[PDB]
C-alpha cells in the first residue's frame, strides 16, 4: 500500500518554523576582544546568529495565513517560515490563543500551496492518519498511525480541549504540524504528547480542524479569540462534595467562587449556589456549560437559574469578556 | 477535582 | 483506509480496571484535625478515597466473565469494572494463574458485549493487529501494528510463555487488554513489553487466545488451572556430553535436580540421569516435556526411562499436582 | 490487511550475527580453580562459553555474501551467522567501509535464501516499509512503518550519508537488518536511530540499497572502497563573504584548509581560495563536490579553478588515494 | 544455558 | 598535645551495638536446597545469620545499664553489645523515650567499666571534646573537636531537646556514642548531625548528660518517662499581632488548636486565645512552657489565665499523661 | 585545652545577617482569594513575610561598621543584622568590593561589641584558629582548626586574593564570619571553601585582616575602593623564551593585550612588548605588578620600560582608575 | 597554642609530585593543524605542557630518597618532585610494593631536608597529629587531628594492613603525605580515606612508619619486598567446626585451597587439612600466620603440622617466593 | 513556627 | 550553522 | 565476620 | 594548565 499521493498533496503546505538569537562566539586567547587588542582579529564579524528551530506550521490560505501551536511561537523574537520548496519569509504574528494553544501567522508570498481541509467530525477511531512535521530538527518527516481516540478532554493541558489521539509518532519539533487523513486532508494540528522519555510512545494529541478553524477565523477577524465570561468558579457535585455543602443528593455544578466584580457578582451568584440553567440551557455537565458561555457573545443578557438553600432563584447577568490567563 | 472557571 | 469497523467490533468488550485506596487528607494550620480542633472544619471525611487505574480487561462472556493479567489483579481488594458505555460494577475475582499471568473476573451486568474470538494458531507474522487498553489512564485507546513474531517462549517473564509479539504501541495501563486482528477478533491478551524507558518502544507481548481460553475455562470450572507435576528439575543436552549413545537432542534432557520427596523422587530418579522418555514419549526438549507433564492428570502412573551410567532403566512414577510458586 | 507475504519472501534472507567468548563459571568457595585446588570440581571444565548478539545481516547473494553495518562487525574476533532456518555458520570478513557504516561477510552454505533487491530511487515518502532485525536479542522481529523521508544528509553519523527515514520501530539489534518494501524487496540496511531514550521513538535511518550495492561490489573486489583525495577542508561561503561577483553560493566553496603535502597542497591551493570548479564541475555545494572527489579515480590529473584576490587561477592537481579516518 | 522445572 | 588519658578513661565504657537477622543462603546450580536435591551438598546450614551494626552505646552503670539513641535500637529484635575488650553479650531493652531519642539497655556482665559522668551545665562553648563511636563499621573511633554551642533547640529533630554541638567528626555508627570532655568524662550522647553529604561536616549534636541521665533513671523505675499534658498546639506571639493590649513575649503564647477530649478541652481553652499564665508562670515562650507542663505531675489541677476577645478568662485544667507520638 | 575565653571576646562581635521577602500565605479551596469569593475568609492576613539568612558579619567599629562578604549581600534588598545579644537592626550598605569579595554595612546601635584586630602578617601555619559563623542557619557556631597555609593566590576566586587556609569546618552560612586567633583577635573574614559535598572537607579560605581592614577604610572614605589602571593583560616569561636579555628573569611579564584607549594604550605599550620596569620597580612577577598598579593613585604619571624586538623603549603613562568588573 | 614549630620542622621534608601528559593544543578554525594548513600557525608552540598533580612524598633521606604511595606513582612516565623551596626535580622509581601501597623514589639534589622520625609503636589513640600534603592542587597544606585508632587491619584496601586512623582532614591530593606527631616526628604516610562525599569526613588512614621503613629499606636493597609463599587459602575455624577436639583460636587456620604446584601443594597439603603449626609457631589467626609466612625468607625448609581426618600429620615445605597480583 | 504541643 | 567538509 | 587469607 | 596567561591592570 502507499500514502505517497496523500504525502504529495499534503507535505507542500507543511512549513517548518525557527527563531534567531545573535550570540557571543567562544572567545580566543590570542584574538582581539571588544576591550582588548591582541595578536589577531576577525575579517568582518563580532557576533554570530544561531538558528533555533521552533516547530512546524501549516499553510491554510494562499493569502499566507498559517496555523501553529501558540507554544511554538511563544516569546519569539523573530519567526522565520521555511517552506518545503526552500523559500524563506519573515512571519508576522497575527494573534495567539493560550486557552486553545493556537497562534496565527501571516506571510507575504506568491505561489503558496494551501492545505485542503477535511471534516474532523467525520473521523473515527481506527482511521489511518499521517502526521507531518519536523521532529528533532531532522527535516520534514511524515509519520503514520491510526486515530487512537477522539474528543479528549480531562488531559489538563488547555482551558478548552477537543483532542484527537494518535498512534503516529509525534516528537519534539512536530508541534504545529499537520495531522492528515489518508487522502491528505487536514484533520488536526499536532499539539502535545504523553511520554516518560520525551519521545513518541504511541500517545500523541492534535487539535481537531473544526476547533482550530474557529480560532483561526476569529484571530484574523479580531486578533483575539473573543470568549464569554460569567466569573464563576465551578465544581461538580459528587456524593461527598454534596454532603459537605449540605445538599443530600443534589447533582450538577455548584459554585465555589465568584470572580470579584465579574458578571456573576453583579448578577447575584453566590458561593454554594447550585446552577440549574444557564441562558435557558440545562447546565447538567460543566464542560458543556463552560463552552456554552465561551461562545455566548459578550455584552448579552442571559438568565441564570440557581438553586440556593433548596429554592429556585431567577438571576440575571450581563455576559462579559473572558480575561486572559 | 472537576473544576471549571467560566 | 480504516480499522474503524474492527474497533467497532472490538472496543465494546474491553474494560478498564480501577481500585480505590483510602488516604488520610492533607493538613492545614487553620483546619480541624483528627486529634486537633483549629479555626475551621471541612465537611468532607478525613480519608480521601483515591481512584487508581490497575489496567484493562476483556469481556469474554455475556455472563460477565472477564480476562486480565494476574499482575493487574494481584494485591487489590476491590476491583471496579468500567465498560465503554460508562456502566461501572464491582468484579469478584474467580481464579488466578501466575504460571501464565492470567486471571478471571466474574461481573453481573445485563446487556453485556462479549468479544469475538480468533485462532492464535491462524496468525502469521506481518498480519495487522490492534491493541485496545487504557495506557497511562488516558482513557481507552486503540493502537495499530503488526504481528512481529509468534511463540516467544524462553523470555523469562512467566513459567508458561507462548507469547505474540506486536509492534503496536503497548504501554503501562494496557495490560490485560485485547490484542485484536484486523476484523476485531481476539488473538491475545497484552501483558508485558521490552523497554529502556518503561514505555512502548515497539516490542510488545500478548498471551495468545488459545492458551488464555485453556486457562480461563479451567479456572471457571475449578478455581485453579490444575497441572500435573513430577518434581524434576531438568537441563538441556549438548552433543559434546552426548558422546555415549549420542542423539543430538533425542531423549536429550539431563536431570539437574529432584524435588525433595517429589513424585519423580519417589520413583528413583537421581540427578545427572538423562531422561529418554516420559509417559511413553520421546523427551528431547525441556519446554516440550514441561508442557507434556503439565497436561498429564495427577495420579496417572507413567514410566520414565533414563540412561544412567550407559544403562537404560525403566522407572515408574505417579504424577503429582504442581505446587504453587 | 497482511504483510505476511512480504515477510515470507524477505525474512528467510535475514540472519542474526552473534559473537562468542569464554568467561569462567560462577565462582564458589569450594570449587577447583586455575589458581587454587579446593573440595569440588564443576566437572573439570575451566572455561564456559558466552554468546552475545551483535545485530542482523542481510543475505545479498546465494553465494554467501552478507551485508551488515561496520559498527555491528568492528571489534568482533569471531562472528557466527544464524539464519532463520536454524543453521549457524562461522562467517569471515571481506572488508569494511567505516565512511558508510557498511561491512561485508562471506559465508559458505548450501541452498542459501537470497534477498530480492529493489530500487532505492523508486521509493517515495509514504510507502509502507518493514524492518527485519534482532532487536534486544529477543529473536528475529518484523516492524512495519512508512518512509518518513529520503536523502537524509547532514546527520553527522558518517562521512557519506544518504539515509531513508523510517517510522518502523528500530531498536538496538536492528543494525544491519533489512528495511524492506511492501513486496519483500530490499530498500535498505538499518543503521541508526534518533532517540531521547535509546529505543524506538519513530525516527529510524537506513542506508539505501543502491549505495549499499556499490559499496558491496567495491568491497568484494578491491577489498575496500577506493576514493579520491584532494586533502581540503571546505566551508560554504557566507552571504556576507559572497560580496564578490559570484551571486551568493553560485560556483563557490571556501578553502578553509589544505592537508599537509596533500594533492591540492602540492597543486598550489592556499587557504582562502574560492573553488569555482573542480574537474570542470560547478562545485556550488560542499557535499556534491566531496562526492565527486570520492568518485574520481585516485591518480587522475584534474583542473581546479580558484578565485583568489579578484583573479581566477587555474591549477592542476593529482587526486590522491583518500586516507583512513 | 537454561533450566525448566516440572 | 595528647587526649590519651581521656581516651583511657572513656574508651572502655563505649560499646558497639549490632543486630543479627539470618540472611537467605545464596543458591548455586550444582548445589542442593530444600525443594531440590542436586549434585553436591555443602556440609552447611540452610541459611547463615549475618550481623548489621546499629550503633554505639555508653555503659552508664556497673550493673550493666547502657544508654543509647532510640533510633539506633527501634525495631531491632535482638541487640548485641560488643565490648571494647571483645566481650559480646545479648542485651535487653529496658524501655525507650522517643521524645528525647534515648533508650536504656540492660546487660549482665561482671567487671564492667562504667563511664564517669561530667556536668553538662559546667561546659562552655570553646571547650575541648571527644566523640567515641563505631562510625561506618570501621571500629571504635575517637575524634576530636570543640563545643560549638550549647542549648540547641528548634532543630526539629526531637520533641524535647537541649543539644550540645561539636566540631568533632561524627558519622553514621557514632549514634549512641559518647560525647566526652578533656578529662574523658561523659558530657553527651551523640544523636544527630547536619550533613549535605551524609558525612560529618563539623556540625554534630549530642544530648547533654543532665537531660540524658534524668530520662534514664525515669525509665529504670518505670518503663517510660511520665510527662504532663494539656493537649494544646501553641504558636509564638508575633509583636504585630500583639497590638491588642500586649507585648511580644509578655505572658504570650497564641493557641492554634486544642486536643480533642484533652485536659485543655475539658478546661475550655480555645484555638486563637492568648495564654498568659500556666500554673502561675508567665509562658512567655512556648518551649519554656512545654517543658514546664511536662514536669507538672499528671492529675494536678492548675490555673490558666488567658486573654480572649480582649477579656481575661480564668480557666482550670487537670494535667493528663502525655500520649505517645 | 579550652578556647572558652577566646569565644567570650570573639563571639559578641560576630553577627548573623538575614533578608525578609513577603510570601503568599497557604491557600484553601473554601477560602476567599484576591481573585475569588469563597465560603470563608482568612481574617484578612494578606501575606506572610518569612526571614531568610544570608550569612554572618563582623563588627569592626563601636559606631557599628560591619564587614561581610560582597557575595553574602549582593542583590538583597533588605538586610537585618541580628546580634549575639538578640538585638536586630536594618543595616545600610556602605560599599562593595567585588575584587576582594568584601562588603561594608552600617548600624546605629548603642553598646556595640567591637572585634579586636590581629596581625594577619604575624600568623604562622600551625597556629590554632577558630571560625565563628551562622552555618546552615543553625545560629552562631564556633569551630576549631589550624592555619593550613597563608597567602593563597591563584585560586581563581577573586581578582585580588590573599588567603588564609583553614582546617576549621566552615559551611555555607559562615561567609562574612570571623576567623580568629587563639587569643580571640580577628585574623580574617572566612569567604569560600573547596568541597565535593558542599560541606566542609577541611579546606576553607579567609580574606586576611590586613587586606580586609584596608578595603573597609577605603570604602568608608569613598563608597568604593579606588585603584590604578594600565589596561594591560600579561603572561609569565616562558623559561625557554628568555632568549635575548631575559637573563636573571628581569622581565617576567609579557604584554598579552592592551585595554583600548587605556592609559598604557595611549602611552604606546603594544601587545607582545616585554615589561621590565613599572614606576622604576621590578616587573618580574605579574601579581606583584597588578598589586603595585592597584596601589598607585590615579593622576600620577609613571614610567614603563618595555623591551620591544630587542630594543629598549622608555614609555610614559597617566595612571587610570580601574573600572568595575 | 601553636603547632607552627612542628610545621617548621616537618614542612621542608614534604614534596608535591608532578606528572605531565603529552597533549597538543586543542584545534581552533583559522590556526594551522597537525594535518591541515591555515592562514595562521599557532606561533611556534605546536603543543603545550599540561601539568597533572598526583600527590605528596616525604623526603626520607638527604641522598634524595623519597616515600609515597604506589597508587600515586603507578602508570606514570615522568615524575617531577617539587620541593617546599620551589626547586623541582625529575625522579626515577627505585621500587614499588603494591601489597602495602608504597613506592620509593630517588632524587638527586643537595641540601635536601630529611624528615626526623617517630616510633610507630609509641603513638596512642588521642595523641594530636598533623597531616602535611597537597589536596586538590591548592598547595602544601597542614591539617591537625588526633589518632582515632591504631592497628587498623581488616580494612580491605591492601594485603598487608596496619593503619593509623586519623582525624585530620585528608583529601584527594594528600596521598604519599606525612602523618606527623605534635613535635613533627613522622609517624605515617597518608594513604586512604573512607567517605561517601569523595572528600574528608574525618576518617583518614596512614601507613605507620614502622611498616613503611621496613618496606623502604627492603626496596632500596632489593628493588622489591621479598615475601614467603606457602600457596594456601585459609579461613577461621567456625565455632561448630571446632567440634573436632579444637580450641576456636587453637589451630584456627583451616585450608580452603592449595595453590597449584605451590610450596604447600608439593608438601602434601590438601584442603580441609587444619593447620596447627607453621614453622613451629601456633597458627592461631590467619592474619598472624600471613605475616609470619611473608616474613619467612624463601627457601627455608619449614615443618607444617596439620590435623588431617583426626590425625596430627607432620609436613615439610620449601617456602617459596610470593607471586605478584 | 507554631510547633509547640504540650 | 557553520560546518566543514574534508575531501 | 569470616574472610579468607591467602599466603 | 600552568601557563595561566591572565593578569589585568
Residue numbers in the entry:
A (entry chain J), C (entry chain F), D (entry chain B), F (entry chain H), G (entry chain L), H (entry chain D): 53 to 377
B (entry chain I), E (entry chain E), I (entry chain G): 5 to 10
J (entry chain A), K (entry chain C): 4 to 10
L (entry chain K): 2 to 10
How does the study describe this entry?
AlgW, a membrane-bound periplasmic serine protease belonging to the HtrA protein family, is a key regulator of the regulated intramembrane proteolysis (RIP) pathway and is responsible for transmitting the envelope stress signals in Pseudomonas aeruginosa. The AlgW PDZ domain senses and binds the C-terminal of mis-localized outer membrane proteins (OMPs) or periplasmic protein MucE, leading to catalytic activation of the protease domain. HtrA protease is characterized by its trypsin-like catalytic domain and regulatory PDZ domain; the catalytic triad was surrounded by several loops (L1, L2, L3, LD, LA) but, usually, in an inactive mode, and could be activated by sensing a specific molecular stimulus. The catalytic triad (H123, D153, and S227) sites are located between two β-barrels and are surrounded by activation loops L1 to L3, LD, and LA (named according to DegS nomenclature).
Protein samples were mixed with two types of peptide activator (tripeptide WVF, decapeptide SVRDELRWVF) prior to crystallization trials, yielding four complex structures, AlgW-tripeptide, AlgWS227A-tripeptide, AlgW-decapeptide, and AlgWS227A-decapeptide, with resolutions from 1.8 to 2.6 Å. In AlgW-decapeptide, each asymmetric unit contains a DegP-like hexamer that is stacked by two interlocked basic trimers arranged in a face-to-face manner, whereas the intertrimer contacts are stabilized by the long LA loop extending from the protease domain into the PDZ domain of another trimer. AlgWS227A-decapeptide could even generate a DegQ-like “cage” architecture after symmetry operation; the dodecamer of soluble AlgW contains four trimers, with the 12 LA loops protruding toward the interior of the cage. LA-mediated higher oligomerization is an important regulation mechanism in the HtrA family; however, very few close contacts are observed between trimers in AlgW-decapeptide and AlgWS227A-decapeptide structures, indicating that crystal packing may, in fact, dominate the above-described intertrimer associations. Fortunately, LA loops could be reliably modeled in AlgW-decapeptide and AlgWS227A-decapeptide structures, allowing us to explore the conformational regulation mode of the LA loop. By comparing the two sets of decapeptide-bound structures, we found that the LA loop shows joint angle shifts of about 7.65 degrees. In the AlgW-decapeptide structure, T72 forms side chain hydrogen interactions with D130 to maintain the β1-β4 association, while in β2, the side chain flipping of L106 not only disrupted T71-V124 interaction but also changed the dihedral angles of S105, leading β2 to form a long antiparallel sheet with β1. Additionally, K73 and E103 also altered their side chain orientations to adapt to the conformational changes. Eventually, these structural variations released the LA loop outward and exposed the active center.
